[PDB]
Amino acid sequence: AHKSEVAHRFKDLGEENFKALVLIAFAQYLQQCPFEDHVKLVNEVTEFAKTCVADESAENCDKSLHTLFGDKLCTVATLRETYGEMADCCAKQEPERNECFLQHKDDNPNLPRLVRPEVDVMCTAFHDNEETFLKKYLYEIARRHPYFYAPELLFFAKRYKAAFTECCQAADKAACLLPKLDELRDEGKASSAKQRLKCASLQKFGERAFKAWAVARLSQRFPKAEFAEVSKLVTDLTKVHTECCHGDLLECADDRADLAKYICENQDSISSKLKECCEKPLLEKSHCIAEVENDEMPADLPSLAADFVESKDVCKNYAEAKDVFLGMFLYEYARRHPDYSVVLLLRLAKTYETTLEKCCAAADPHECYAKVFDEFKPLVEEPQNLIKQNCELFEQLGEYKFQNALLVRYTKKVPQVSTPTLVEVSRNLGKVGSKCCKHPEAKRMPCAEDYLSVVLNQLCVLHEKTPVSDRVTKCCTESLVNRRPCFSALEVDETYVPKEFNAETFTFHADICTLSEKERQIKKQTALVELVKHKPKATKEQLKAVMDDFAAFVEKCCKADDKETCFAEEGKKLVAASQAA
Numbered sequence: 001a002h003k004s005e006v007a008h009r010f011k012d013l014g015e016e017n018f019k020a021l022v023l024i025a026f027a028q029y030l031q032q033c034p035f036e037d038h039v040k041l042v043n044e045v046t047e048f049a050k051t052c053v054a055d056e057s058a059e060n061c062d063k064s065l066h067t068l069f070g071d072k073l074c075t076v077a078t079l080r081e082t083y084g085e086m087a088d089c090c091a092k093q094e095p096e097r098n099e100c101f102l103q104h105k106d107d108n109p110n111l112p113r114l115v116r117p118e119v120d121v122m123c124t125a126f127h128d129n130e131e132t133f134l135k136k137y138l139y140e141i142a143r144r145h146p147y148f149y150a151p152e153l154l155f156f157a158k159r160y161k162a163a164f165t166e167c168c169q170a171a172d173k174a175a176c177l178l179p180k181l182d183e184l185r186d187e188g189k190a191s192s193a194k195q196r197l198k199c200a201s202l203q204k205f206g207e208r209a210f211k212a213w214a215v216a217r218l219s220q221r222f223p224k225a226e227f228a229e230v231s232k233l234v235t236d237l238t239k240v241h242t243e244c245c246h247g248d249l250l251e252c253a254d255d256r257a258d259l260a261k262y263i264c265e266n267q268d269s270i271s272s273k274l275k276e277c278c279e280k281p282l283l284e285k286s287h288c289i290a291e292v293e294n295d296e297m298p299a300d301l302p303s304l305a306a307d308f309v310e311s312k313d314v315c316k317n318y319a320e321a322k323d324v325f326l327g328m329f330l331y332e333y334a335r336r337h338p339d340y341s342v343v344l345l346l347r348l349a350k351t352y353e354t355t356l357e358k359c360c361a362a363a364d365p366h367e368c369y370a371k372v373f374d375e376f377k378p379l380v381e382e383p384q385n386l387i388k389q390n391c392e393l394f395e396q397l398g399e400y401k402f403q404n405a406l407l408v409r410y411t412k413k414v415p416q417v418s419t420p421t422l423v424e425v426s427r428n429l430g431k432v433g434s435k436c437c438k439h440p441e442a443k444r445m446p447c448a449e450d451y452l453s454v455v456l457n458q459l460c461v462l463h464e465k466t467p468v469s470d471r472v473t474k475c476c477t478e479s480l481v482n483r484r485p486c487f488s489a490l491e492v493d494e495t496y497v498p499k500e501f502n503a504e505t506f507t508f509h510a511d512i513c514t515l516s517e518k519e520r521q522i523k524k525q526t527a528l529v530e531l532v533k534h535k536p537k538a539t540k541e542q543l544k545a546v547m548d549d550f551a552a553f554v555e556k557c558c559k560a561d562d563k564e565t566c567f568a569e570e571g572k573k574l575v576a577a578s579q580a581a
């Protein structure tokens with residue numbers, strides 16, 4: 001190996017990348033420490049890295065990256081008064097002292113809300129001091145998203161710096177800042193959600209589940225590449241995502257850069273869509289590789305019948321190698337079905353292996369798998385019909401009405417869940433159809449099923465901290481690929497005792513008449529959640545009508561005077577109406 005691995009990482013990543021990655025790692029481990037302490041720690045670490053790269057014979061950096069980072073970290077966090085039950089695990093040492101910070105990551109911290117100052121003062125402070133401003137941006141974005149993907153974060157910071165340096169020195173200021181930065185924040189939220197999905201899969205269902213997922217995704221993405229190249233790529237990026245998800249940020253970025261270099265070195269052996277990615281810089285190179293379009297469908301592809309169902313030695317070949325055989329099957333199937341969802345391909349592979357384990361090593365083997373591909377017809381027909389009906393229900397209802405419909409549906413399904421997480425999950429579930437119902441019936445399903453799984457994993461992780469619904473936990477821990485089939489097959493919870501009537505939850509105030517559109521919509525959806533929880537047995541049309549009445553008075557008397565009079569009168573009237581249904 002390479003002695004003084006901190007020096008090796010510093011040499012490979014560079015100076016500024018090393019500093020930014022160390023800042024990201026520190027901010028993700030400590031989500032409550034102030035920015036100045038993180039800057040001081042990062043500066044000390046990078047001076048140590050400079051000293052050790054200057055002379056490898058240093059007597060201190062013979063230690064590993066994890067113990068070095070912990071030593072520089074938990075001495076500041078050695079006080080168990082401000083961070084709560086956080087300094088306890090600094091007492092122990094490697095390797096449990098890494099779990100110290102791994103298990104203490106807070107997905108939903110109660111950090112103070114951002115103010116978002118005006119554009120002019122914002123980028124004049126940017127011009128006043130850029131490095132501190134960008135470090136503050138990285139620290140703030142890493143605080144609220146402890147499971148962010150670090151090289152993606154570096155790319156986002158680079159794009160943010162480029163936007164600031166490019167489009168506020170011009171004539172107008174906000175015209176470029178607001179829409180561009182809104183697009184970047186939406187991209188950041190989406191990337192954080194995807195990386196949280198990957199990290200949760202790796203940390204819960206094992207490395208094999210993520211390896212199978214990545215094999216399916218890459219085979220769907222690189223149909224031309226042979227199985228050896230796909231296996232090498234999935235091993236490399238599985239190591240990468242394990243390293244980021246385990247807190248090994250520096251080596252994770254290093255390995256992602258190496259993977260991008262390999263991929264654009266061997267494009268011709270992998271895919272033809274990569275010819276336009278690595279001409280970009282390293283960060284943009286990796287981003288393009290991670291988001292490259294699917295390659296063209298190869299011709300003369302067999303139907304999988306002669307090799308996987310008709311072959312008489314299929315169960316034997318499974319017997320010698322189970323993991324390799326299932327990887328080959330999943331790779332071939334994902335090659336032949338790019339329109340199929342990745343988790344759908346995982347479900348199909350699981351069904352195939354369950355059938356093979358069930359019978360081929362019992363009685364006549366051939367008298368099962370000759371018809372095993374007939375078992376996949378309902379497995380693919382269910383998601384197609386589900387997303388078809390969801391997109392149809394979305395097309396004439398629109399954004400907000402679709403949000404309301406999904407919200408009342410999921411509140412009926414699992415009323416025990418807390419209101420804010422339920423509202424957020426419903427909002428994202430409406431954004432599903434908002435983003436990929438416009439595609440034809442050849443690319444709707446990837447968006448649909450994949451980002452449905454992303455949002456459902458967000459629900460599962462938000463529910464893990466305060467487990468209150470038995471079914472939600474039961475089928476969030478059950479399987480990673482069957483989350484959406486569970487949350488679709490769940491029926492109305494009969495055992496749920498209706499929530500006690502509280503008039504406060506159905507009464508609005510002056511603030512909603514002057515909030516933004518998003519905040520007013522969220523408050524209205526929260527009121528809908530409370531109403532459905534109060535009367536879970538009501539029908540869909542009744543809730544639709546009462547929500548129509550809610551919007552009716554909200555847009556009736558938010559523009560007139562005597563606000564309190566309207567609030568009181570309308571609240572009492574609609575409370576009486578809802579009580580009388």
Ligand SMILES: COc1cc([C@@H]2c3cc4c(cc3[C@@H](O[C@@H]3O[C@@H]5CO[C@@H](c6cccs6)O[C@H]5[C@H](O)[C@H]3O)[C@H]3COC(=O)[C@H]23)OCO4)cc(OC)c1O
Binds near residue numbers: 125134142187
């Ligand atoms: C654009 O990138 C993203 C930003 C964000 C949010 C976010 C959301 C915004 C915004 C700015 C910011 C940023 O805050 C900016 O960063 C500066 C950080 O440094 C401080 C200062 C340093 C020295 C003086 S001020 O000022 C800050 C700026 O005001 C602010 O625009 C990020 C800082 O960390 C975050 O979480 C923040 O204006 C409109 O809505 C979320 C993203 O996805 C989840 C994302 O992709």
